[PDB]
Short mmCIF file of C-alpha atoms in Angstrom, two decimals:
data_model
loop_
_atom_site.label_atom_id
_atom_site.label_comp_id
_atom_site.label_asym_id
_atom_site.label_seq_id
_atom_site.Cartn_x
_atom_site.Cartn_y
_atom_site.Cartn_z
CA UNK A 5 200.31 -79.05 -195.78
CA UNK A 6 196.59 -78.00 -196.03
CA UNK A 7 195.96 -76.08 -192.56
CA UNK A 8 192.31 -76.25 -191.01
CA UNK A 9 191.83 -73.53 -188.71
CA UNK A 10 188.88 -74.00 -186.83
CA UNK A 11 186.87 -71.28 -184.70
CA UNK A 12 185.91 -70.01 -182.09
CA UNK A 13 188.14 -71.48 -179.99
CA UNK A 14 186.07 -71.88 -177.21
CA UNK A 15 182.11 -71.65 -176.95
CA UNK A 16 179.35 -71.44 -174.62
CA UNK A 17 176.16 -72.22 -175.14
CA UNK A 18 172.59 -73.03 -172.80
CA UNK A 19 171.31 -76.54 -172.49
CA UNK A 20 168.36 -77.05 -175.52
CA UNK A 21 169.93 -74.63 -177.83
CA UNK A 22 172.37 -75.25 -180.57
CA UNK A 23 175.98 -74.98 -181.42
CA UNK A 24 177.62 -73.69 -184.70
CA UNK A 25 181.06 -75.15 -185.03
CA UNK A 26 183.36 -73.54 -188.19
CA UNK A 27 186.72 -75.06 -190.27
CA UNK A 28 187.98 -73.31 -192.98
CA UNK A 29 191.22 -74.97 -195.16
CA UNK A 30 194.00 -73.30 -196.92
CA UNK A 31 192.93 -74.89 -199.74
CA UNK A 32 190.24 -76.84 -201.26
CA UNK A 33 189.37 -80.33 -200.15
CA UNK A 34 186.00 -81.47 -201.66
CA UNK A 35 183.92 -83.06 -198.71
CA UNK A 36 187.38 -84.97 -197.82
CA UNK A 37 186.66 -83.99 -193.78
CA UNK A 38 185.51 -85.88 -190.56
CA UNK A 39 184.48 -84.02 -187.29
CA UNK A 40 185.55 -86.11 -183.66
CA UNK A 41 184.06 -85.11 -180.25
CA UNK A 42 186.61 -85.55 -177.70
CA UNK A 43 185.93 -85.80 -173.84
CA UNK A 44 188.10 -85.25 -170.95
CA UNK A 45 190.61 -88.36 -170.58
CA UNK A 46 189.29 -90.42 -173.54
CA UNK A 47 189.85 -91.13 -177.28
CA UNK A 48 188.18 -88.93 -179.87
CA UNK A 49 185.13 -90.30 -181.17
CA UNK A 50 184.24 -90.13 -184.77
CA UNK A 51 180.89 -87.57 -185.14
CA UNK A 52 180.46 -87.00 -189.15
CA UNK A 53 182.53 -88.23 -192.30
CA UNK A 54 182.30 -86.83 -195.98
CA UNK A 55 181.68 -83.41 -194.49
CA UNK A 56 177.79 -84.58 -194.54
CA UNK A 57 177.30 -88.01 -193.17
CA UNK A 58 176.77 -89.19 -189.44
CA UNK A 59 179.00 -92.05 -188.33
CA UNK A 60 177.02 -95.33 -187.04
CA UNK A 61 175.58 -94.75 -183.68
CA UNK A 62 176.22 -91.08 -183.72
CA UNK A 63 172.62 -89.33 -182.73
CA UNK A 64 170.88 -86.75 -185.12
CA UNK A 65 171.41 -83.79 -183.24
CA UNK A 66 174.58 -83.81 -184.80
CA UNK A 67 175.18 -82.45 -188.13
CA UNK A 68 177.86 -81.82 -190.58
CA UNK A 69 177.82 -79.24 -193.57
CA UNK A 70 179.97 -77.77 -196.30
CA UNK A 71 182.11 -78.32 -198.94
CA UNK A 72 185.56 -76.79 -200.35
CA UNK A 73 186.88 -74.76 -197.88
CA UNK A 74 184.29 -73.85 -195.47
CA UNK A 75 182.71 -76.36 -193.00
CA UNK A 76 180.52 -76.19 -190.42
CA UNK A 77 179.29 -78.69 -187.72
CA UNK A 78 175.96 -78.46 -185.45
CA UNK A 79 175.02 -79.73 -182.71
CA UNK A 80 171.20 -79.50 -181.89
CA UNK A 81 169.19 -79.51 -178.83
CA UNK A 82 172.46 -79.28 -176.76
CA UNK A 83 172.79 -81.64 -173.29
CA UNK A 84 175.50 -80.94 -170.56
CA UNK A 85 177.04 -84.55 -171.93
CA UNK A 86 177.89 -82.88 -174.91
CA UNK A 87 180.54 -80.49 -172.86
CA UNK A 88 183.83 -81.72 -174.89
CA UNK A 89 186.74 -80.39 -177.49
CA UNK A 90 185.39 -80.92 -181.04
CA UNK A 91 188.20 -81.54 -183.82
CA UNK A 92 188.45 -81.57 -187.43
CA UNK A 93 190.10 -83.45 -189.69
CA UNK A 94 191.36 -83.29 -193.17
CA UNK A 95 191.61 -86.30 -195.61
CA UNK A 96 192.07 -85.00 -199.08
CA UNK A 97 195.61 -83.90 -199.51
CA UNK A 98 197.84 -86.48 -197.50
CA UNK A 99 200.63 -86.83 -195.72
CA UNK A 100 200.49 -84.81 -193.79
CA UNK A 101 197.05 -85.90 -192.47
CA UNK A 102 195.94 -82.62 -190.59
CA UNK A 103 193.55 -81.37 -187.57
CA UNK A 104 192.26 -78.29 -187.04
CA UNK A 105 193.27 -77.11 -183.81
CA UNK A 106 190.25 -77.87 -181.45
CA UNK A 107 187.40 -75.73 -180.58
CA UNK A 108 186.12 -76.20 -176.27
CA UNK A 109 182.38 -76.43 -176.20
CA UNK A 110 181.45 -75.28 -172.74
CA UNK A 111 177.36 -76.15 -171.49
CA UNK A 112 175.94 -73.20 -169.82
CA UNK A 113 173.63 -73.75 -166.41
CA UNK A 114 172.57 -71.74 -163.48
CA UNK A 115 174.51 -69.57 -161.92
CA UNK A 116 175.25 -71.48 -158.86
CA UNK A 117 177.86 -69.82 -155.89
CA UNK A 118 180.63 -72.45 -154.36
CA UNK A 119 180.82 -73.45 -150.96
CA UNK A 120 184.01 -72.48 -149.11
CA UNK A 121 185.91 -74.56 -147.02
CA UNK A 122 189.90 -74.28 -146.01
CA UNK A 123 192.37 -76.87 -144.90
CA UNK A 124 195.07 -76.18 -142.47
CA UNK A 125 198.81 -78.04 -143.43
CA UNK A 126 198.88 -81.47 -141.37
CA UNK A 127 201.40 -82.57 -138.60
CA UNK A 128 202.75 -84.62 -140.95
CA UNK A 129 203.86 -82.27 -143.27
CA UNK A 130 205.21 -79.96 -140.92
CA UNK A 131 207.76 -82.31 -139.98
CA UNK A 132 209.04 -81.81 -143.42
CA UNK A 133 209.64 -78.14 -143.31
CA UNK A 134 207.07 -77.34 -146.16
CA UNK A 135 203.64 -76.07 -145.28
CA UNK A 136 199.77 -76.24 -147.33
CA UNK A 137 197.13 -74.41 -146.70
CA UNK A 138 194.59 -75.09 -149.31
CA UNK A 139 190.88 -73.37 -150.14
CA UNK A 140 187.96 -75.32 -151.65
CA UNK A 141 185.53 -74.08 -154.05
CA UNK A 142 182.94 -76.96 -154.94
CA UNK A 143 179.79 -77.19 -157.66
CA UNK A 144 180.00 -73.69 -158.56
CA UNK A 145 179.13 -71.85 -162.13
CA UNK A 146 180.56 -69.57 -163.86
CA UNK A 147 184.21 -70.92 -163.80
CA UNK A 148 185.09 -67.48 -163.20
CA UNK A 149 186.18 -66.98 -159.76
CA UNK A 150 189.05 -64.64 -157.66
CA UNK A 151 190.58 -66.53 -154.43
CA UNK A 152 192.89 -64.58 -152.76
CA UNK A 153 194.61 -65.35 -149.25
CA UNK A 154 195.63 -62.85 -146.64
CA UNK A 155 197.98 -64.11 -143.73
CA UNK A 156 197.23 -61.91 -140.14
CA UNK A 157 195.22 -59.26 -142.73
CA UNK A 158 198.09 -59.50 -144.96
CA UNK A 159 197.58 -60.13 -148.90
CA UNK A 160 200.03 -63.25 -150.63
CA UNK A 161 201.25 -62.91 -153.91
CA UNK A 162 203.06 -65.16 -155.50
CA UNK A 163 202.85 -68.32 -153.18
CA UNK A 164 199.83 -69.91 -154.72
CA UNK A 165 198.34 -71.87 -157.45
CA UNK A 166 194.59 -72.67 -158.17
CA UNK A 167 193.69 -75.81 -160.19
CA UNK A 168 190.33 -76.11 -161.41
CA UNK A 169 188.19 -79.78 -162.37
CA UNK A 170 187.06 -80.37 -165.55
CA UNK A 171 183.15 -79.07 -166.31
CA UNK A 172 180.97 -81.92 -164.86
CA UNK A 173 179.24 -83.87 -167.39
CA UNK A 174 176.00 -84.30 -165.27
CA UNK A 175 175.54 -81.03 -163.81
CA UNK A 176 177.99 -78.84 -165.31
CA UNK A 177 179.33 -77.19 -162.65
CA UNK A 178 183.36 -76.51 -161.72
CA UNK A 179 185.04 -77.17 -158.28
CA UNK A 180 188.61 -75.33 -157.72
CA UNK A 181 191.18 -75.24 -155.25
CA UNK A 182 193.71 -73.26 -154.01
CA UNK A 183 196.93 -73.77 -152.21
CA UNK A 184 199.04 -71.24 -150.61
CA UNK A 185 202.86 -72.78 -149.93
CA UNK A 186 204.90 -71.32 -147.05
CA UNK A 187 207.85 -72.83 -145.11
CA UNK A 188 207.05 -74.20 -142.16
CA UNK A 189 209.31 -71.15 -140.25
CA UNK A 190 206.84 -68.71 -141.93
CA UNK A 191 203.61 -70.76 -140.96
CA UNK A 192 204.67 -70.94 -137.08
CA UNK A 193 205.54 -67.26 -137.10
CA UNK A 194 201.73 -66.20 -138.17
CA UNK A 195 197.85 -67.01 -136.71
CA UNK A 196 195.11 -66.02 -138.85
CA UNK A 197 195.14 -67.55 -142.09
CA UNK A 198 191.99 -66.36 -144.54
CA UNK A 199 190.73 -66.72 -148.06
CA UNK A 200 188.37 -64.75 -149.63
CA UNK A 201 186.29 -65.58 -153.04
CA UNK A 202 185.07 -63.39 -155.13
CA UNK A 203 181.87 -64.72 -157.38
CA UNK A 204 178.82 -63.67 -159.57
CA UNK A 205 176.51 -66.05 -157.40
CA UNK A 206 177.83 -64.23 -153.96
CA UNK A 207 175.84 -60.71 -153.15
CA UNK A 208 179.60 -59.96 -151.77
CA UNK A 209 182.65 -61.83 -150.83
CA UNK A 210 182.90 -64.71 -148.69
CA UNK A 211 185.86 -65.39 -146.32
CA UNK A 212 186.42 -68.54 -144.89
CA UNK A 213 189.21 -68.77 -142.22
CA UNK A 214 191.58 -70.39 -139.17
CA UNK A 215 193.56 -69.45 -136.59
CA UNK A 216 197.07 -71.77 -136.19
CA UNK A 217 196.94 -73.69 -133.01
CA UNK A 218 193.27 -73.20 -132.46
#
């Protein structure tokens, strides 16, 4: 099979400037190769065919070179829309038909520092012997962040996970949460619950926290 590695594989680059976008196959296949912009939760769209030429409706920022083994796409005057995965494609030496393996085109903004808000476990799920206690961080950028929880001063490892939204397509900012699992036992047994973020847009950490049965 012809393999098409593409690189990097991720990039970020500031709204108005332009992105350079690289494929290179393990062996020669003319101007046989599409690029495809993919979005979160959607179909890949068709960008550029024939190495060179811009499908219909595609805009002009968006431009396809190469030929042989080397190809490279750009994409002009970049918008925060444009935030996607960005695929090539192979069509000269088939089946296989092949891909290269993505590359993540992140849009860069202001650094902007998440507000922090925490969420004790319900009633409701106390009854079933399981206990969340989750942390908010929304419309903040970099995606970088630390979040990490200390029960009455004490630090948790090992009891959470963090999920993270996909870059916003408007504004490009991330939200993330956090949520720290205990037994219900364990949750009745402490008071303060705390967690603490760690950001380039905060002058120093911010800690956000509740006392159980307050």
């Amino acid at each position: 099979e012809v393999v098409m590695t593409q690189s990097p594989a991720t990039l970020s680059v500031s709204p108005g400037e332009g992105a350079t976008l690289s494929c290179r196959a393990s062996q020669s296949v003319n101007t046989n190769v599409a690029w495809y912009q993919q979005k979160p939760g959607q179909a890949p769209r068709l960008l550029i065919y024939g190495a060179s030429t811009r499908a219909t409706g595609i805009p002009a920022r968006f431009s396809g070179s190469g030929s042989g083994t080397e190809f490279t796409l750009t994409i002009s005057t970049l918008q925060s829309e444009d935030f996607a995965v960005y695929y090539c494609q192979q069509y000269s030496n088939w089946p296989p038909i092949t891909f290269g393996q993505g590359t993540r085109l992140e849009i860069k903004r202001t650094v902007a520092a998440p507000s922090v808000f925490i969420f004790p476990p319900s009633d409701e799920q106390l009854k079933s012997g399981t206990a969340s206690v989750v942390c908010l961080l929304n419309n903040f950028y970099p995606r970088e962040a630390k979040v990490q929880w200390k029960v009455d001063n004490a630090l948790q490892s090992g009891n959470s996970q963090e999920s993270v939204t996909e870059q916003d397509s408007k504004d490009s900012t991330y939200s993330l949460s956090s949520t720290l699992t205990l037994s219900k036992a364990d949750y009745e047994k402490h008071k303060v619950y705390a967690c603490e973020v760690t950001h380039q847009g905060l002058s120093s950490p911010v800690t956000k926290s509740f006392n159980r049965g307050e």
